[PDB]
Amino acid sequence: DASPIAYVNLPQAFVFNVTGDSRDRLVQIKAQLMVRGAENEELARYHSPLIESSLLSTFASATVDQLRSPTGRVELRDRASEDIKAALNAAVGKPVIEKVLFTDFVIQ
Amino acid sequence: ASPIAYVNLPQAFVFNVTGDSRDRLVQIKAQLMVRGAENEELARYHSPLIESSLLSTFASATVDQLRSPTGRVELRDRASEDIKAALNAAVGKPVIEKVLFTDFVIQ
Amino acid sequence: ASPIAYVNLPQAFVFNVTGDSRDRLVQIKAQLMVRGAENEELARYHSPLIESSLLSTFASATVDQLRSPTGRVELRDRASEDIKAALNAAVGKPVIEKVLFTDFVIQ
Amino acid sequence: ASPIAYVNLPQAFVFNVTGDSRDRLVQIKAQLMVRGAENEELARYHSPLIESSLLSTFASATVDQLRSPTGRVELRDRASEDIKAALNAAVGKPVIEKVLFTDFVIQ
Amino acid sequence: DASPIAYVNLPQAFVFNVTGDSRDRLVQIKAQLMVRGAENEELARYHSPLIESSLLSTFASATVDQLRSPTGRVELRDRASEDIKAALNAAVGKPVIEKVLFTDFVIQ
Amino acid sequence: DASPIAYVNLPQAFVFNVTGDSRDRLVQIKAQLMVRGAENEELARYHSPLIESSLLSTFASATVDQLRSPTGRVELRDRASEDIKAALNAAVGKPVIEKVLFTDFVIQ
Amino acid sequence: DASPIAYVNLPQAFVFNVTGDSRDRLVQIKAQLMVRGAENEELARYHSPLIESSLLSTFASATVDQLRSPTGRVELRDRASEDIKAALNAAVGKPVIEKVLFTDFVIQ
Amino acid sequence: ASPIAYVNLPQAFVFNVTGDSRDRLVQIKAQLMVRGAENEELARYHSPLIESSLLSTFASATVDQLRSPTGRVELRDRASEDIKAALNAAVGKPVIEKVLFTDFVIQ
Amino acid sequence: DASPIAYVNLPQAFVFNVTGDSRDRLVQIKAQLMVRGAENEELARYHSPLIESSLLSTFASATVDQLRSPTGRVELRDRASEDIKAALNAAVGKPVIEKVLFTDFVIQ
Amino acid sequence: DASPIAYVNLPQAFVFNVTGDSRDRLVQIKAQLMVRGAENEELARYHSPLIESSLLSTFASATVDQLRSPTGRVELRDRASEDIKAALNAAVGKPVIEKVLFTDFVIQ
Amino acid sequence: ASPIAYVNLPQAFVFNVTGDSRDRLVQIKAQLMVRGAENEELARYHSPLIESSLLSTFASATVDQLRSPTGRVELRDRASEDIKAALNAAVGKPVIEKVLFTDFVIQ
Amino acid sequence: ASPIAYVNLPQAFVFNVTGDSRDRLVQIKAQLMVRGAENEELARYHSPLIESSLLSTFASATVDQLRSPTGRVELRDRASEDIKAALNAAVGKPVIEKVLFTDFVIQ
Amino acid sequence: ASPIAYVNLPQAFVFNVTGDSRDRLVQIKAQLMVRGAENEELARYHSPLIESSLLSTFASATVDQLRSPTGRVELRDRASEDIKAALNAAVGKPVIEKVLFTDFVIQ
Amino acid sequence: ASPIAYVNLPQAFVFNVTGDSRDRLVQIKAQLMVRGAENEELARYHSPLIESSLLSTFASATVDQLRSPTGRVELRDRASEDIKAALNAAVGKPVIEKVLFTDFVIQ
Amino acid sequence: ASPIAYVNLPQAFVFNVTGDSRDRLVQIKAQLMVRGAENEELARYHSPLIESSLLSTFASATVDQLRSPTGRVELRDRASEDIKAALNAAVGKPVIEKVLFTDFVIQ
Amino acid sequence: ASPIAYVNLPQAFVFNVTGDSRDRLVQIKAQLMVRGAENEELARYHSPLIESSLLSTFASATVDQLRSPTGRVELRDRASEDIKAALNAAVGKPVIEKVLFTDFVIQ
Amino acid sequence: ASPIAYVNLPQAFVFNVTGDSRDRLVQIKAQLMVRGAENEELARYHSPLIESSLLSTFASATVDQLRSPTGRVELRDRASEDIKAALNAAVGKPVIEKVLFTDFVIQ
Amino acid sequence: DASPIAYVNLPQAFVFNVTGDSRDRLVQIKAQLMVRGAENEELARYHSPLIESSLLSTFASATVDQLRSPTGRVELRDRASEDIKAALNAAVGKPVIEKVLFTDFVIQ
Amino acid sequence: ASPIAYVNLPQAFVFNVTGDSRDRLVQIKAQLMVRGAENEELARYHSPLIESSLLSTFASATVDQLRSPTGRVELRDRASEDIKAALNAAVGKPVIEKVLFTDFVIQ
């Protein structure tokens, strides 16, 4: 009965440009948020516009050398998850989420 | 430090880059982050004016402010201060706290 | 002063510029900024005249004016002063305060 | 005179130019600015005749009357008198006051 | 001519082809009927299938250079009106229409 | 003698391939029947399949020059009327229709 | 009585390829049945799947010579009718249709 | 001399048979002609077995047999005897009399 | 002695690539399960996701030459039906199906 | 006492890239979860976002010779299963699934 | 001779007849039997006149006439004559042949 | 002379007439019979005036007139002359020919 | 002989019968039994005439006949013979074989 | 001499008048009769004021006026002049020509 | 020994039986049990005749049989054997095996 | 401003008043007559407060006032002055000109 | 000088009060009048608590109060100050300014 | 500063009878819950079938004079709250709700 | 222990109990409170057996028990043990933990 895991769905997928090597490509990322506790579930859901901002800002600084690599995608989640906590810690004083989950990842 | 509230701007801003031979379009989906139930009421009512302040900021953005991480973050700080200055002249008070970009593509 | 109100012109304006290089289509979305319930009523009831006035204003602009930041700002001002000068000759009062552009593409 | 009224012609006037080196289509969307409660009634009833007078005006228009800013204004003036002359010869009254162009593109 | 004016709509536009220079075009004309009197308005609707045919037989005998000229267009509209009157006089003995109105005219 | 005119709709659009010379051009013909008399009206409706068959039989001999001259179209339209009669005249003993009308005629 | 005319509709058009052919040309025939009598109409409807089978056989055996000559169609409508009668004569012991009718015919 | 019944197979049989230089696609729409009421009840229940037997028969044919009308006749008889043999080993009864073809295209 | 035959449907159309991609082709298969007894019919429906999995595993080894020869197609049908039995033999302890039936087989 | 089999569907099909050798290739895997027990069935549904994230992190690290060889997917399913069990063990403390099934696999 | 055709009058005729104990509410549903396609056309278009002549006929019926078979055959054969005379004055043709009673309650 | 046309009055007439003891409730469904397309056009357009003349005539009729079929015909011709006299004063034309009763109950 | 066919008469029959202490409603739902494909064609087309010959027959039956089992059997044959005598006068053929009663209530 | 137009008042007027032995529920359905498009435009817009003037005139009449045929005629001429006097103080113009009664029940 | 199959009769049976004080209202919902695929085909096609033989049998039953449990078994068997006699004369075959009662109420 | 506007109150005003014999319902349908576009904006926005001032006024009405034509006029004039008093205390402006009663039934 | 806003409570308050002769069903529909966008937010969120304090006040009132125009005001003020007492204990703010009654009946 | 207030709606009204001195008067109560904290809002919604039971057991024990007296309803309100807290302390271990609210209360 | 779950029973239990003067209805709305994810599946799948065991317990209780607050508590505890006894005999598990009554009227 310790703080139960809950998943806040970010329904709108993230399309963005990768700063690629002379290749104009689009990356589509469908993500969700893993939280623990009820008041974190309603906080991450209520502040989802700010969370959608932290993710899109993180995905821009990601290189195609970092997206194509499996190890880079793992490091991408860590940096994307930490960037949300830094923004929420400054806005509401709480690190609401505990990690962000990628459920779809294509490079079109 | 009133509770935070987010005002949505539904129409995504579709505009073209600053003078490029390969004519590409920019699509930005934005929202407003306000503090206070009164500012939220003001941010919704004057949102047509806020949308114009965002376009005047986007249409004057350089290529660096569209393809660089530091450039995009500056454009966010650029667009926010433009809105505060525009609303400070219309209603006498800066309504928003900052602008939020939830989608940003160049195609 | 009377409270600020906005009148939305829902249909976007598509028009050809008098360009000399190639064929060009420009799409502009606009709303009206008025003050007072009296002018807000007139702005809606005379939207056909206002939609007509904006189209005649845009058609005279060249592409270089659309890319220069001052060209757009002086086009918005020229568009606003034309609607006022047109509604002054139809009802006797400059209904609107200024024209607001919320989206702008050259394609 | 009487308060102004606007009669909408929902038919979009699509026609082709006397193309210099290629075929090209023009799309015109027009309304009717009339003064009076009886003129508004007359303009809406005889809108087929009014729509016919506009097609005859557009089909006889040069390319200068279509792509020039001054000539496009001339096309509006000539189109108004064609309707006045038609309705005066049909009902005895020049029902409309002037024709308004809400959309004017050349694909 | 003393009766009030009425307008009978022909809702289906007229698609036909005319002999071009060497390639035939495809002309589309949206037309309406102008009548005077409730009796002529009554007949113009009931006999519209015959009126639709008399216009098609008129447009079939048209050429492109006749279409791209003010006189050739006015000649065509006036000829299309007399042909219907001749057709309806032969059927019901009354030229129920005053003239044919052209509301839209494209040629592609 | 002079019965009230009635128009019977043949809803099927006649698409057929004219024996083109330059290329294989299609033909789209939409027809309606002009009859006089209430008995002829329901006879034309009940025998519409037979009347449509008589229209395809006469269109099978149509050449390209047949469908492009206005004199040849009237020549064809008259052959369509007299053939529909002869078919119905030998099937039900009565020439049912008066004329056949063409309300849509394109070639492309 | 007089064995009144009756028409049984075959709603789906017949699409098949001409035999031979330089290429593999497609043709589309929309057919109906013209039966005589109230009992033959019931038989023609209930036995339509077999009647549709008898038409595919007759259709898929026609030459491009036969499908483009206007008299070749006549020799085909009669061949389609005689084949259905022979088929139904062995199925139910009665010739049912007395003829078949074409309402649309294209050679794409 | 039991009553004749027609069991319909809605989904048309789309398959491919290799020619000389073609990835040739064939479409066949078929129905089942049965005799008696018990077989009509059995032909509907055992349709997946019947549809499978038909697909197995068509795949074994060559484009030569699909061209010649005689070859198509011995394709119905080969499809019928295959269906009967398939139902004999499953329910001990040849359920159908003959399989009918209503559509046959090759493009 | 003979249990009643039942047919369990698999509405999923199996789409997969031919393994030999020197000739890059795509094949679509629609299958149905043939079982006996009401208990096996109940089992085949409940374990359909497992049965769908065994078919995909069988379709992975199918060679392009095996998909073309009809003797190889029945070699694949008699193999895919055995793999399903082996799969269900290990999961629930009894071979649920009798054979797999193919109702659509195209190589696009 | 026994734990009957239960299948937990994942309706979202997985779309990703291979890091292809010749060019960028698109893959589509449609998966389902095969659990045992009633508590695990509801655990598999509630933690679907975490499970879908683990399958994506597994499919991304897979190569082309894995996705084109039959046993390469056999190794992929095991790695897909073991990664989910390791993820859920750190999150909820139980290896919920015990295996993952593939019902559709296309590398286009 | 001029094949029989039936023209349906969907309006169920509702009218009152004066009895002795209480007022009687009669309800009649009728049709029209005509011969010839032209008389069938006239019977439909002149239905408001035919419905009028049936009400005038049924309103004069005594309660003893309704509760009597020979009285209803008298009323049935009388309403037909009253329609033939009504249409002879309007179009000069005895359109119908007879009137059919399909339902008859008196309650 | 001219073709007969029937203009239907969809809204039935409900009113009250005083008998001996109670106040009665009458329900009349009426249709107009005209000759000529001109009069059919006027009877439809001037229907509210026609619906007023019928109510002005019905409420002035007694129960002994509504009950007597010989006197009920007098009401039909009385209502017709009242409409003709009314329309002769509004448009100078006796538009209708006669009023028709298609349903008549006396509750 | 000829194939049996049943022609449904969906509009059920509702009529009164003269009792002693009350007028009782009678609701009969009937169908037609025909033999041959042509009689079925006539029974449907001449259905309004057939529905009339039943109302003339049903209304002439006393309560002592409707309650009796034998009374219903003779009424059925009487209603059947009445239709044949009616259709022999109209189209010279006795179309039906016998009338069937599928519902019989007396209230 | 302007063309006649009719303005419909949809919401019926339900009011009370007090007679002997009971109250009275009166229900009047009315339409306006105007001449000219300007009056037609004014009558529709000022209907809430017109509905009030009718209710103010209706609720002030005695039961002997609603029951008398001549009493209703003078009520129309009284209700009409009360509207003209009301609209003379509102917009300085008597808008209507007369009021019409299309349904008049009294319970 | 053919497989069992049930043919439904959806519309229940309503009929009257004579009791001591009143007429008792009986409602019977019934189905048919047949053996064989062909008999099931005839049972549905000859439902109007089977519905006739059932109502003809139910009318011959009294209250002391319906309220008696053993009196309903002989009724179920009488209704069954009476149907077989009706179909032995109609189609030369006894179609059903026996009739089934699923719902049964009185009064 | 000069132009008259009507603000509608769609809620029915149902309330009770104690009479000389029994409690009495009242149903009043009211609308607001304002002058000017700015007043129309306040009247719609402050309808909850205005609806309260009407109920607070109608609650104090006596049965002899609602039935007296002079009383309703005084009540109508008192309900308007009460509304102007409430809006003067809330927004500092007397928004409405008068209150209009379109439907009034006491019962 | 804060803007006024109205928070509606849709579910009308139905409660019972004990009278001299029987119980009386009182039905009150209320709205909330607040000043400030912040107080409008709390009034909506805490409406379940506000609907409770109103019933805790309404159900504790007498019939002599609800029939008194003065006591009805003292109730409206008692309910207004009772809500401030609860919200000053829940969130420490007098969220509302007063309560409004839009309908007040006693059944 | 304890926790933000939240309201959990019990949309099903409570209907029950009480034995009056003359009749069996019917009561109708529509209730809601006031909780503080996001977890208590989550628990009160999930355990609503238990909370609705603790109200019916409490309401059914109340007399008729206890309902008409406003001082008795405040006692019934504060009593129904403690009966829920004791029920949830034994069920889940937390006094989830803070107090019960009454939005509608009639007697018949 | 295992987590708590609630298995709803949508069938409201309607039955009768024998009172001293008449038979009083009883309406009990019940739900199942299970502990364990497996028990939830068993409780849902065995609802027909559970609904059977509840009615066997409800239809056996007396009126003095259903009206007793303490008598209802031991009814809830007895109906709970009745389900556990039945499910232990069928599946060898006491699936439920206790029954919950959500609504309980007797009327």
Author numbering:
A (entry chain F), E (entry chain J), F (entry chain A), G (entry chain B), I (entry chain D), J (entry chain E), ...: 60 to 167
B (entry chain G), C (entry chain H), D (entry chain I), H (entry chain C), K (entry chain K), L (entry chain T), ...: 61 to 167
Sentences from the paper on this structure:
FliL, a component protein of the flagellar motor, is known to enhance the motor performance under high-load conditions in some bacteria. A flagellar protein, FliL, which is a single-transmembrane protein with a large periplasmic region and associates with the flagellar basal body, has been found to be important for the function of the motor under high-load conditions, such as the highly viscous environments in some species. FliLPeri shows a remarkable structural similarity to the stomatin/prohibitin/flotillin/HflK/C (SPFH) domain of stomatin family proteins, some of which are involved in modulation of ion channel activities in various organisms.
Therefore, we determined the structure of FliLPeri with the same region as that of FliLC. FliLPeri forms a head-to-head stack of two decameric rings in the crystal asymmetric unit. FliLPeri forms a ring assembly in the crystal with an inner diameter of around 8 nm, which is comparable to the size of the stator unit. The N terminus locates near the ring-to-ring interface and points toward the outer side of the ring. The C terminus of each subunit is arranged on the inner surface of the ring on the opposite side of the ring-to-ring interface.
